[PDB]
Amino acid sequence: MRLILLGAPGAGKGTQANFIKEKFGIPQISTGDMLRAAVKAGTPLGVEAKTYMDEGKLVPDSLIIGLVKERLKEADCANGYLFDGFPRTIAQADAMKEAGVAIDYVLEIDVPFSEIIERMSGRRTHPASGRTYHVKFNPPKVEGKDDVTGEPLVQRDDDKEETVKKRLDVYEAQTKPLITYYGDWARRGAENGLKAPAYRKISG
């Protein structure tokens, strides 16, 4: 199993990642973890990456991909691997191809945006007790009040409908080019000696 896993924020990718990695005994690979491990281990690419990070600068694609190639050489990738939230751009996708990183499937977690927005933004809590409510699925008996105490209910700023929608929009514009990139390649055939990954919407 050699996988890219794509999922919108709030779509529950983290737990699905965990399910998939457990089932095939393949490691979850993300750029954050790769950078930190490489930096901590004083690897040559890690020291180089740190020169950018110390300065609040973008670590360049050339370097991330270099960390990827070393990462995939490790023992734990012998049965395969799961990219979580990488690639993010078509140039990264294309760098991975040109670097010879094999990918069998692009799996896109399938959970409609309206369900995500609905799920998160209707949430309310009573902070003193931790009691939760949902404006739709578990409404308080009196709007904006805790059933037990009568005290005010709150909504997290991160959960506000338009904050959530803005996160999905960004994800969407990041992800669509990646799906197109891989779909077009799969219709063209093998490149750099690699087959395009097969696209699956998994719901799943």
Keywords:
monomer, 204 residues, alpha/beta, two-stranded antiparallel ribbon, ATP binding, nucleotide biosynthesis
In short:
α2 packs across α4, α3 packs antiparallel against α4 and α6 packs antiparallel against α7.
Report the biggest beta sheet as strand number plus sense, adding barrel if it closes: 5 strands, parallel
| Class from helix and strand fractions | alpha/beta
Please state the second-level CATH architecture: 3-Layer(aba) Sandwich
Can you write the helix and strand succession as a string?
EHEHHHEHEHEEHE
* Fraction of residues in H or I helices: 40-55%
Span between termini? 16 Å
- What's the count of strands? 7
- Tell me the radius of gyration: 21 Å
Number of individual domains? 1
CATH third-tier fold name: Rossmann fold
What is the strand arrangement across the widest sheet? 2-3-1-4-7
- The CATH superfamily is P-loop containing nucleotide triphosphate hydrolases
Strand content: 5-15%
The CATH class, by name, is Alpha Beta
Name the overall outline: elongated
Q: With helices defined by DSSP (H or I, 4 residues minimum), what is the helix count? A: 7
EC number: 2.7.4.3
Catalytic activity: AMP + ATP = 2 ADP
Enzyme class: transferase
GO molecular function: adenylate kinase activity; ATP binding
SSE diagram, text form:
Blueprint: E1 2-6, H1 13-24, E2 28-29, H2 31-40, H3 44-54, H4 61-73, E3 81-84, H5 90-98, E4 105-109, H6 113-121, E5 123-126, E6 131-134, H7 161-188, E7 198-202
Parallel strand pairs: 1-3, 1-4, 2-3, 4-7
Antiparallel strand pairs: 5-6
Helix pairs in contact: 2-3, 2-4, 3-4, 4-5, 6-7
